[PDB]
Design an enzyme around this catalytic site. Structure first.
Site, short mmCIF file in Angstrom:
data_model
loop_
_atom_site.label_atom_id
_atom_site.label_comp_id
_atom_site.label_asym_id
_atom_site.label_seq_id
_atom_site.Cartn_x
_atom_site.Cartn_y
_atom_site.Cartn_z
N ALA A 255 -61.15 -4.50 -10.87
CA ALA A 255 -59.84 -4.39 -10.23
C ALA A 255 -59.96 -4.76 -8.76
CB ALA A 255 -59.29 -2.98 -10.41
N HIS A 256 -58.82 -4.75 -8.05
CA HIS A 256 -58.85 -4.96 -6.61
C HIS A 256 -59.59 -3.85 -5.88
CE1 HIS A 256 -57.59 -6.34 -2.67
NE2 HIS A 256 -57.07 -5.15 -2.42
N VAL A 257 -59.69 -2.67 -6.49
CA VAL A 257 -60.41 -1.55 -5.89
C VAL A 257 -61.91 -1.61 -6.18
CG1 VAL A 257 -59.75 -0.22 -7.91
CG2 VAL A 257 -60.59 0.95 -5.88
N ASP B 204 -61.51 -10.34 -2.87
CA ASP B 204 -60.20 -10.23 -3.53
C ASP B 204 -59.08 -10.19 -2.50
OD1 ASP B 204 -59.09 -9.90 -6.39
OD2 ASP B 204 -58.05 -8.30 -5.32
N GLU C 222 -56.19 1.80 -3.14
CA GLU C 222 -57.26 1.71 -2.15
C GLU C 222 -57.43 3.04 -1.41
OE1 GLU C 222 -56.83 -1.49 0.56
OE2 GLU C 222 -57.28 -3.05 -0.91
#
Ligand SMILES: *P(=O)(O)OCC(C)(C)[C@@H](O)C(=O)NCCC(=O)NCCS[C@@H](CS(=O)(=O)NC[C@H]1O[C@@H](n2cnc3c(N)ncnc32)[C@H](O)[C@@H]1O)[C@@H](N)CO
Lengths: 68, 1238
Positions: free
Chosen positions: B1216-1218, B1127, B1145
Site C-alpha cells: 500500500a501507500h503506507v 510512492d 499515514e
C-alpha cells in the site's frame, strides 16, 4: 570449608624458581617439585611474598627475554 | 514410668556351633536356669514404663533335628533367619529372649541365641552363654546348680544412681561439654549426607586379614608403640586421608562398667563416645599414635558418663555427632566344655549409622580388620577398594617409618590411569594470533555479512578495511606492538572494530566500565599505563583529569585503504587485560596471552562448529571475559555478529525482541539471567523468539539442572555448561546441559565437565595429593590456556600461580574452587575455599569491601555479609544482596547513608552494600569466630496518584505492604532479576515503556514515578553520522524523518543519513501558508550542511513533493545525482481519497510507536493538508528514481505518464501507500537505493 594452606598465614612457606625464572611459594614441609629450585628465602607467608615482590622485577619468562 | 518414647525393635542375634557330644535336654534346662538366674533378662515395657517383672517365666528351647534334612545347614540358617527377620514386639508381657537348639549332625549343633538390644550387647551376652555352659557342665559332673554370679537389677541401679549423684558426674559432664565444644564436625566415607538414627538392621559385614606382613614390619620397627595404638593411628589417618579432612569427629567404644562389674553384668555395657581427631601433615606416625593414646587415656577417666546424656544436654539434630566409629576391643567368645569345640558365629549386631571399623592385631604381629557398613550408604566392592587403600597405606609406612602423615599416598594405581586419560587433551594448534585467523576467514568469504547493528552492516572485506584503518590510526597515535589500549565505548559496531584494530596493531585491549567510580578507573589506568584511550566525545570530560593519557574519539567509520593484514601481532603478546577484585589490595589485572585465547577459540570452533548461516549475539559487556568469544569466535568461522542495544542485557523482553530481530543462533547466559529470562517466557514467546537458537552457553555460576530441563522443555535449544576463571582464558571445562547427559544428573547442579584442548584439571587435597572420586578437594588448572599473570604484581602472581608437582617446570593456577570428579570422570562444582562470591555471575571479593568499609572514618571494624534480605523475592537465580555491618570506634552513630554514598566513590556499583547497619557490638558467640547467623536482617510518604500503583507492585513482588513512599526497592529485598519482572509488570500497567535499567539508575517510589510519568526533535535528525557523501531524507506529512531509521542498514557504511524535519514550535510547516516557503526554507538548513558538491535526496509522500521541488531549485543553481521517491504523486492528482490516505499515514505513524506533548504530530498533519491543497510543481529538468506501490489506486496513467511532464525509472513492489516505507519493503528498496548510489 577447606581453608587452603596457601591462604593460611599460620604456616611457613619458601620461595621456589623454575627455569623461566618464574617465582612461586611452596609449603616448607613439602618436597620442592621437580623442575623447581629454592631461591634462598623461607619463613612466614607474607614475608616470602614480600621477598618475591622485590626480587621478581621482569615478569617476562626467561625464554622471551633474549628475543626482546 | 521412666521412659517416654517406645524403644526400637531391633535385636542382637548369634549362634554357637558345638562340635561334639551334646546332651540336648540337659542343655535346654541349663538355658532355662541360666536365663532365670539373671533378673535383668526378664524385663518389659508398658505403654511408657521400662521395668523388671520378677514374675516372668522362661520356656525350654525348641530342639529341632535337621539331620534327616537334605540340607541341614541351610535349613538351620533359614530357621535362624526366619526368627531374625521378624520384628520384636516390645510391649508384650513375655520375655524378650529366644534360644533354640538345632541339630545338623550327630556331633554338631547350632545353638541360636537372640536378645532385645536393651537386654544385652556385643560384650555381655557371652557371660550368659558361659553361665549356661557352666550349669550344663556342672550338671554333667553330678554337682548341684551353681549360684548366680550376675549382679541383680537393684544393685546396678543403686550403683548407677550413686554415679548420677556422685561428684564425678558433674566433672565428667563438664569434661564432655568441653569435648563437644571443641569437637569438629563429623565426616563420612560415603558422599551421601549423614542421616543420623538409622532404621535398617540389615548391614554389610566384611572380614579381612592382611597377609602382606607389612604391619608386622611397621610394628617391629616401632618397638615402643603399642600395637593397638599403632593400628588405631593407622585407621585414624586412613579415615582422614580418604575423606580429605584433617579434623573430623569419629566415634570410639568405651565401657560404662569396668572390672568384675563388667564381667558379671548382663545389661548394656559398651558406651560409644565422641572422639575428635586432628591429623597433622608434619607429624610422623609415632607422634599421631602418642597424641591419640594420650587423648584416649584422658577420655577413659570419664567414660562412665553415658553418651545419650551427651546427646541430651548437647539435641534436636538432625546431624549426629560422629559418623564412623573405631573399635579396638576384643570380645572373648570362647568357652571350655569337655570334648567339644565351640565357635560363636554372628548374625545380628544391630543397625550401624555410617561405618564401624574394628582392628585386631594378633599375637603373631599381623593385622585383621572387621568392617560394618550401612548397606544403603555403601556396597562391598567399594569397601574392598578402601581396604586396599589402607593396605598400601600401611605398606608405605612399613617401608619408611619416617614418612610424614602429609606425604602419604592413598590413591590406587588404576585411578592415576583414569586421571591420565581424562587430562590427556594434547591437540597440536598452529602458532598464530587472532588477527591471522580473522584475516584468513576474511580472505575466505569477503562478501559475507560479518558485523552489524541498528545502523551499520559490514561485510568481511569492509570490516577488515575498517580494522586496518583504525589500526593505522592507533599506530599514528603512537600505539606500538606490546602496548595496551583502554576502551570506554557503548555497544555498537565500533566497539568490535576497536578491539579487532587494537589486536591488529599488536596491542592488548583494556575494557573499562564507565559505571565504575573515577577513583577505581584512575587506579586501573595508573597500573596498566595504556598508550591510548578509545572513547566517545561525551565520556572524555571524565578522563580529562587522568594524567599522561592520550585519548581518541572513535564513533564513525574511516576511509578504507586496503584490507591487508599488518602482521604486527605475535603469539607472545598480551591479548586482553581484565581487572578483577582483589582480596588484599587494589584490584588486579589478568594478562591473557594470544596463544591462550587462540586455543580457547579454536577449541570452541571445533567442539561447537559454526557456519555462515549462524548469527552470534553481542550481549556480554566488554568488562566480562565471556564477551571475548563474542568479539572474535564468529569471525574465525565465517559467521555473523550482531550488536545488542546498550543495557539490553538486563532486559529479557529486549533480548526476545533482539533474538527475534536478527535470528540469533548463538548466545550466552548467566544461570541467574537464564532463570530471569525463562521467567519472562511463555511457550508462544519462546517459539516466537528462541526458535532460531541452535547453541546456548551458560557459565559463571553453578548451573541448576531443573532450570536446564525447564529450558529444554520450553525451547529445545541445546544448552552447554562451561567453567573457568578469568585467569584461565575464559573457560576451561565443558559439559552438555541438555538431553541424555542432563537426564542422568543426580545432583542439583550440572557438572562443569571435561577439560578443553591442551588443558588439565587437577583436584588435589590439602597435601597437594590427588583425591579419589567422590571426594571434595581444591581445584587446580594446568595447560596452555593459563594467564600470563597479574599485571605488575609479582606477589599476587606467585601466590596464585604456583609450582606444579606433576608437570616439571610448569605452573598451576589455584582457583579456590572446591570440586570433585564423578564415576563418568566429570568434575562437579561444589563451592569455595575462600571468601570470594559469584553474585548473579559477578566476581566479588568480600575482603576488599571489608577493608574499604573499615577504612571509613570512625570505624573499629566492619563485616560484609551476602544474604537474602526478603525470602519472598526468590523466584530463581541468585537473590543475595550485600549487607555491611559496622561498629563505631567512638560509640557514636555513624550516619550510614553518607557512608554508603562515600563507598560509592571507591567500590563498583554492584560491590557497594545496599544496606549498612550499625551494631553496638559485633555479634560473636563461642570463641569469637563472628557468628553470621546472629547477624540481623534489615527491617522490611506522599504516595500520589500514579506512584500508588508503583507501591502496589512493590508490595506484590516484595510481599511487604509499603505505605511509605521514598522507599528504596533494593533495601527492601529487591534485586536485578526481580527488577526485570517489575519492569514488565509496570510496562503492562503503564502506557509508557518501563525498563529495568531505569529501576537501576533510580531505586525509589518517587524517583521511578518521576522518570516514568534520543537523537532529537530539531530540524536535523542525525540518523547516521558517516564520513563521505550524505543522503538527505525529507520529512513526510508527519513532519518527522524517524521512519528512515531502517534505511541506514542497507546503505554503504561510508554514507551519512541526515533527515530534515519540522519541529512544530516555530517550524517551517506551520509558519508557511505558501507551500514553497517551506521548500525554500529547507535550503537554509540543507545549504549549511554541504554547500557545494552533488546532492543525494530521498523523500516519502509529502517529502517527495519537497524532493522534486528542491531538485529543480538546485538544478537552477549544483547537480542532483539521485532523487528517490517512495510512492510519491503530483499534487494535481482537495481530493476525497487523499484524506483517507493521509489519515492512514498518520494512523500507522503513531500506532507504530507506543508511549503527551507529541500532539505536534497531529499539527504537522493538519499543516500538511492545508499546504497540500495548494498545488505546486516544477518540471524538474533532471532525472530521478521512483518506487511505486502496486496495490494502490487505478488510472493506467500511473507515474510513467503522471510524472511524464516532470526521465525516470520505476520499481514495483506489492504494498500500500503506507507499506512502501515499512521495513518489509525496505528489505528490497534498500539494496536498490544503495546499488543506485554506488
Ligand atoms: P544485578 O545489577 O546483580 O544484574 C544481574 C545481571 C545478571 C544483569 C548482571 O550481574 C550480569 O550481567 N552479570 C553477568 C556476569 C558475568 O557475565 N560474569 C562473567 C562470568 S565469570 C567469568 C570468569 S570470573 O572470574 O569472573 N568468574 C569465575 C568464577 O566463577 C565460578 N564459575 C564459573 N563457571 C562456573 C560453573 N560452570 N559452575 C560453577 N561455578 C562457576 C568459579 O568459581 C570461578 O572461580 C567466566 N570465565 C566464566 O565463563
Amino acid at each position: 570449608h577447606m581453608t587452603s594452606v596457601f591462604d593460611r598465614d599460620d604456616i611457613q612457606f619458601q620461595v621456589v624458581v623454575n627455569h623461566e625464572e618464574q617465582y612461586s611459594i611452596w609449603p616448607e614441609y613439602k618436597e620442592i617439585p621437580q623442575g623447581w629450585r629454592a631461591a634462598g628465602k623461607s619463613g612466614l607467608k607474607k614475608d616470602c611474598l614480600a621477598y618475591i615482590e622485590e626480587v621478581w622485577t621482569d615478569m617476562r619468562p626467561l625464554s622471551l627475554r633474549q628475543h626482546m | 514410668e521412666k521412659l517416654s518414647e517406645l524403644p526400637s525393635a531391633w535385636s542382637v542375634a548369634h549362634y554357637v556351633e558345638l562340635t561334639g557330644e551334646v546332651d540336648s535336654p540337659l542343655l535346654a534346662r541349663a538355658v532355662v536356669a541360666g536365663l532365670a538366674q539373671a533378673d535383668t533378662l526378664r524385663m518389659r515395657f508398658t505403654e511408657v514404663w521400662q521395668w523388671v517383672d520378677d514374675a516372668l517365666t522362661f520356656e525350654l528351647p525348641e530342639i529341632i533335628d535337621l539331620r534327616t534334612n537334605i540340607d541341614p545347614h541351610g535349613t538351620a540358617q533359614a530357621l535362624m533367619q526366619a526368627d531374625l527377620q521378624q520384628d520384636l514386639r516390645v510391649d508384650s508381657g513375655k520375655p524378650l529372649v529366644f534360644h533354640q537348639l538345632i541339630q545338623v549332625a550327630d556331633n554338631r549343633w547350632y545353638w541360636y541365641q537372640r536378645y532385645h538390644h536393651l537386654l544385652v550387647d556385643g560384650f555381655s551376652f557371652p557371660a550368659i552363654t558361659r553361665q549356661i555352659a557352666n550349669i550344663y557342665c556342672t550338671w554333667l559332673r553330678g554337682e548341684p546348680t551353681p549360684a548366680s554370679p550376675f549382679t541383680p537389677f537393684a544393685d546396678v541401679v543403686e550403683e548407677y544412681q550413686q554415679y548420677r549423684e556422685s561428684e564425678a558426674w558433674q566433672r565428667d559432664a563438664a569434661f564432655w561439654a568441653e569435648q563437644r565444644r571443641q569437637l569438629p564436625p563429623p565426616a563420612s566415607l560415603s558422599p551421601a549426607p549423614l542421616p543420623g538414627r538409622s532404621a535398617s538392621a540389615d548391614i554389610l559385614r566384611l572380614k579381612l586379614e592382611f597377609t602382606d606382613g607389612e604391619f608386622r614390619q611397621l610394628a617391629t620397627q616401632l618397638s615402643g608403640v603399642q600395637r593397638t595404638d599403632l593400628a588405631l593411628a593407622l585407621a585414624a589417618l586412613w579415615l582422614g586421608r580418604l575423606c580429605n579432612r584433617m579434623d573430623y569427629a569419629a566415634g570410639f567404644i568405651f565401657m560404662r562398667r569396668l572390672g568384675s562389674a563388667a564381667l558379671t553384668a548382663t545389661g548394656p555395657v559398651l558406651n560409644v563416645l565422641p572422639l575428635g581427631i586432628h591429623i597433622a601433615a608434619q607429624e610422623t606416625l609415632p607422634e599421631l599414635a602418642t597424641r591419640l593414646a594420650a587423648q584416649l587415656k584422658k577420655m577413659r577417666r570419664h567414660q562412665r558418663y553415658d553418651a545419650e546424656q551427651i546427646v541430651r544436654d548437647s539435641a534436636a539434630g538432625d546431624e549426629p555427632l560422629f559418623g564412623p566409629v573405631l573399635n579396638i576391643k576384643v570380645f572373648d567368645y570362647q568357652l571350655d566344655i569337655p570334648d567339644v569345640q565351640a565357635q560363636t558365629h554372628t548374625l545380628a549386631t544391630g543397625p550401624v549409622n555410617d561405618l564401624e571399623l574394628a582392628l585386631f592385631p594378633d599375637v603373631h604381629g599381623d593385622l585383621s580388620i572387621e568392617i560394618l557398613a550401612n548397606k544403603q550408604r555403601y556396597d562391598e566392592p567399594t569397601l574392598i577398594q578402601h581396604a586396599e587403600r589402607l593396605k598400601m597405606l600401611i605398606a608405605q609406612f612399613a617401608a619408611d617409618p619416617a614418612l610424614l602423615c602429609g606425604d602419604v599416598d592413598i590413591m590406587l594405581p588404576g585411578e592415576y590411569a583414569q586421571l591420565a586419560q581424562l587430562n590427556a587433551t594434547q591437540v597440536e594448534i598452529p602458532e598464530t594470533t587472532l588477527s591471522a585467523l580473522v584475516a584468513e576467514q576474511a580472505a575466505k568469504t569477503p562478501d559475507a555479512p560479518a558485523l552489524a547493528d541498528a545502523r551499520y552492516l559490514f561485510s568481511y572485506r569492509e570490516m577488515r578495511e575498517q580494522v586496518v584503518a583504525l589500526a593505522n590510526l592507533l599506530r599514528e597515535r603512537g600505539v606500538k606492538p606490546g602496548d595496551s589500549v583502554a576502551v570506554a565505548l557503548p555497544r555498537s559496531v565500533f566497539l568490535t572494530l576497536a578491539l579487532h584494530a587494537i589486536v591488529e596493531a599488536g596491542a592488548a585491549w583494556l575494557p573499562l566500565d564507565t559505571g565504575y567510580p573515577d577513583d577505581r578507573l584512575k587506579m586501573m589506568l595508573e597500573d596498566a599505563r595504556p598508550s591510548l584511550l578509545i572513547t566517545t566525545d561525551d565520556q572524555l570530560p571524565r578522563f580529562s583529569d587522568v594524567p599522561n593519557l592520550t585519548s581518541l574519539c572513535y564513533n564513525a567509520p574511516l576511509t578504507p585503504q586496503g584490507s591487508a593484514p599488518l602482521q604486527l601481532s605475535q603469539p607472545h603478546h598480551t591479548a586482553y587485560i581484565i581487572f578483577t577484585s582483589g582480596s588484599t589490595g587494589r584490584p588486579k589485572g589478568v594478562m591473557v596471552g594470544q596463544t591462550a585465547i587462540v586455543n580457547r577459540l579454536l577449541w570452541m570452533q571445533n567442539h561447537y562448529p559454526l557456519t555462515g548461516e549462524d548469527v552470534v549475539a553481542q550481549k556480554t559487556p566488554c568488562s566480562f571475559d565471556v564477551s571475548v568469544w563474542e568479539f572474535f569466535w564468529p569471525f574465525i568461522a565465517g559467521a555473523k555478529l550482531v550488536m545488542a542495544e546498550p543495557e539490553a542485557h538486563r532486559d529479557p523482553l529486549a533480548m526476545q525482541q533482539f533474538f527475534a530481530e536478527y535470528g540469533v543462533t548463538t548466545t550466552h547466559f548467566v544461570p541467574s539471567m537464564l532463570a530471569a529470562f525463562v521467567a519472562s517466557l511463555t511457550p508462544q514467546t519462546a517459539r516466537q523468539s528462541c526458535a532460531t537458537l541452535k547453541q546456548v552457553f551458560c557459565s559463571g555460576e553453578a548451573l541448576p539442572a531443573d532450570l536446564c530441563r525447564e529450558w529444554q522443555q520450553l525451547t529445545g535449544a541445546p544448552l552447554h555448561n562451561l567453567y573457568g576463571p578469568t585467569e584461565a582464558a575464559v573457560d576451561v571445562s565443558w559439559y552438555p546441559a541438555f538431553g541424555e547427559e542432563l537426564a542422568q544428573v543426580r545432583g542439583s547442579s550440572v557438572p562443569i565437565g571435561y577439560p578443553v584442548w591442551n588443558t588439565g584439571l587437577r583436584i588435589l587435597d590439602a597435601m597437594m595429593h590427588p583425591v579419589p572420586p567422590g571426594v571434595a578437594g581444591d581445584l587446580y588448572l594446568t595447560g596452555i590456556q593459563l594467564a600470563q599473570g597479574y599485571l605488575g604484581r609479582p606477589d599476587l602472581t606467585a601466590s596464585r600461580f604456583i609450582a606444579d608437582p606433576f608437570a616439571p617446570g610448569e605452573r598451576m593456577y589455584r582457583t579456590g574452587d572446591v570440586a570433585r570428579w564423578l564415576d563418568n570422570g566429570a568434575v562437579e562444582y561444589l563451592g569455595r575455599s575462600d571468601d570470594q562470591l559469584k553474585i548473579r555471575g559477578q566476581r566479588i571479593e568480600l575482603g576488599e569491601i571489608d577493608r574499604v568499609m573499615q577504612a571509613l572514618p570512625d570505624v573499629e571494624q566492619a563485616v560484609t555479609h551476602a544474604c537474602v534480605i526478603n525470602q519472598a523475592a526468590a523466584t530463581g537465580g541468585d537473590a543475595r544482596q550485600l549487607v555491611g555491618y559496622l561498629v563505631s570506634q567512638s560509640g557514636l552513630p555513624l550516619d550510614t547513608s553518607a557512608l554508603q554514598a562515600q563507598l560509592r566513590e571507591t567500590l563498583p556499583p554492584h560491590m557497594v552494600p545496599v544496606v549498612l547497619l550499625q551494631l553496638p557490638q559485633l555479634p560473636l558467640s563461642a570463641n569469637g569466630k563472628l557468628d553470621r547467623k546472629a547477624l540481623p536482617l534489615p527491617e522490611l510518604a506522599p504516595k500520589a496518584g500514579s506512584e500508588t500503583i508503583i507501591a502496589a507492585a512493590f508490595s506484590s513482588l516484595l510481599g511487604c505492604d509499603v505505605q511509605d513512599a521514598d522507599a528504596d526497592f533494593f533495601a527492601l529485598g529487591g534485586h536485578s532479576l526481580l527488577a526485570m519482572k517489575l519492569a514488565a509488570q509496570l510496562s503492562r500497567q503503564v502506557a509508557r515503556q518501563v525498563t529495568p535499567g531505569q529501576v537501576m539508575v533510580a531505586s525509589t517510589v518517587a524517583k521511578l514515578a518521576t522518570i516514568i510519568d534520543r537523537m532529537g526533535f530539531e530540524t536535523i535528525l542525525p540518523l547516521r553520522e558517516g564520513n563521505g557523501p550524505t543522503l538527505f531524507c525529507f520529512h513526510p506529512a508527519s513532519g518527522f524523518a524517524w521512519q528512515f531509521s531502517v534505511l541506514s542498514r542497507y546503505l554503504d557504511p561510508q554514507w551519512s543519513i541526515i533527515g530534515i524535519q519540522s519541529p512544530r514550535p516555530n517550524g517551517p510547516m506551520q509558519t508557511a501558508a505558501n507551500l514553497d516557503e517551506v521548500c525554500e526554507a529547507h535550503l537554509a538548513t540543507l545549504l549549511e550542511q554541504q554547500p557545494h558538491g552533488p546532492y543525494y535526496l530521498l523523500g516519502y509522500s509529502l517529502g517527495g513533493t519537497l524532493a522534486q521541488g528542491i531538485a529543480a531549485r538546485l538544478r537552477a543553481r549544483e547537480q542532483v545525482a539521485f532523487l528517490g521517491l517512495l510512492d510519491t504523486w503530483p499534487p494535481e492528482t482537495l481530493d476525497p481519497e487523499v484524506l483517507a490516505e493521509i489519515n492512514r499515514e498518520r494512523e500507522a505513524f503513531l500506532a507504530a510507536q507506543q508511549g503527551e506533548l507529541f500532539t505536534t504530530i497531529e499539527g504537522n498533519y493538519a499543516d500538511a493538508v492545508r499546504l497540500l491543497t495548494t498545488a505546486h510543481s516544477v518540471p524538474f529538468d533532471g532525472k530521478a528514481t521512483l518506487f511505486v506501490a502496486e496495490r494502490t489506486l487505478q488510472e493506467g496513467m500511473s507515474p510513467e505518464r503522471a510524472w511524464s511532464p516532470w526521465e525516470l525509472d520505476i520499481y514495483r513492489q506489492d504494498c500500500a501507500h503506507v507499506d512502501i516505507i515499512s521495513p518489509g519493503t525496505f528489505e528490497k528498496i534498500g539494496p536498490i537505493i544503495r546499488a543506485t548510489l554506488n
